[PDB]
Amino acid sequence: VGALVFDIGSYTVRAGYAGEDCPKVDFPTSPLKNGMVEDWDSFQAILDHTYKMHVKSEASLHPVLMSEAPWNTRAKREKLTELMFEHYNIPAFFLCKTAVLTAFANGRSTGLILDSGATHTTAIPVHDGYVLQQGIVKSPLAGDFITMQCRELFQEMNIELRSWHNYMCNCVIQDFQASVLQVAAQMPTVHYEFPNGYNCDFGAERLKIPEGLFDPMLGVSHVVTTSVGMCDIDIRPGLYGSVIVAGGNTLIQSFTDRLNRELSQKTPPSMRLKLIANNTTVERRFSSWIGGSILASLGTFQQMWISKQEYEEGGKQCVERKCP
Amino acid sequence: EIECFWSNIEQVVEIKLRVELEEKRKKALNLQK
């Protein structure tokens, strides 16, 4: 009956038990193009695949937690509870924002979260665990844009970079990012080889490709600097001293270093700006699910969840009432 | 509640750190002995 924690993230779904450290299953996610559920049939099918194939357990026994995007609309949450409770008949439910779970994973309730996924990169200030909706800044310069710069450059190289083939294409442009991309001006470079053995001297492209998210649209540094501008006046020092990053799409070499430089030179020099270096791929990919797991584990989650009794007593209204 | 969890973990970290320094002292003492 160990509590189950799922992340339904846009580009890879992370699932696991509340008490376990890592999402035991992490597979590619689609019904979440803009950030919330686009296709209820497909989303339901993938969830069913999750419980049955991925974790080999029925949803009628374990308590369940799901996480939704900070900017998701309310109807999405209401329909999500309706679908989940009616179809899978879980004993208790909860919903949490991914940015809040990122700030919890870092053990820092008051924070600013930078994260990106399919088609979106966002900056969210969270104060005492509440996402300031008015302060969120959302930009299209996501990992998809950089990976498409990569894909265009590869096509210009003319390499031969059904759906499974496209998945492979996206993965290789992603795999190339982790090894090569770093944020003649770059000096000799790597010999990264394709599975078939093809390769090249990946030179200045490794520098120019990551430069898009800063300068191709609002770059990440501007995204965050305006995000705090739209928030409260006096909590702003707290956010700068608590800036956090999450998401696998953020995994570029010296990416966090360039962010720290950009914010330090953009923030007033007197300010205590600091970035929490959870820079490892494992850390960023597990951050949100980690927060969900901690949230579920505690002895108070037994009172925070939406018990099946609650949904029997009342309908979709409970999500707005029980989930911040 | 999460802050309380992290403070509990902080207490565990502090006690483990103290115990590890004490064991460092013990290891040095045994090594010189």
For A172-237, give the secondary structure using H, E and C.
HHHHHHHHCCECCCCCCCCCCCCCCCCCCCCCCHHHHCHHHHCCCCCCHHHHHHHHHHHCCCCCHH
Rounded to a whole number of angstroms, the distance from the CA of B6 to the nearest CA of chain A is 6
Tell me the structure's resolution in angstroms, rounded to a single decimal.
Answer: 2.8
Joined together, the tokens standing for residue A29 give 């996610």
* Interruption sites in chain A after residues (C→N beyond 2.5 Å): 29, 161, 183, 216
CA distances from A102 to A112, A113, A143 (A): 10, 7, 18
- Asked if residue A201 lies in contact with residue A245, where contact means CB atoms within 8 angstroms, the answer is no
B5 to chain A: which residues are within 8 Å by CB? 294, 298
Spatial distance between the Cα atoms of A114 and A122, rounded to a whole number of angstroms: 6
Q: Does A110 touch chain B (CB under 8 A)?
A: no
Which residue is closest to A109 within chain B, CA to CA?
B3
Joined together, the tokens standing for residue A56 give 């080999």
Q: Does B32 touch chain A (CB under 8 A)?
A: no
- Asked if residue A90 lies in contact with residue A80, where contact means CB atoms within 8 angstroms, the answer is no
Cβ-based contacts under 8 A for chains A and B: 15
- Residue partners of A213: CB distance under 8 A and separation at least 6: A121, A141, A145, A146, A219, A220
A107 to chain B: which residues are within 8 Å by CB? 2-3, 6, 9
Experimental method: cryo-EM
Q: Which of A97, A104, A106, A126 to mutate to test the interface with B (most CBs of B within 10 A)?
A: A104
Residue count of chain A, please give it.
324
Spatial distance between the Cα atoms of A71 and A187, rounded to a whole number of angstroms: 41
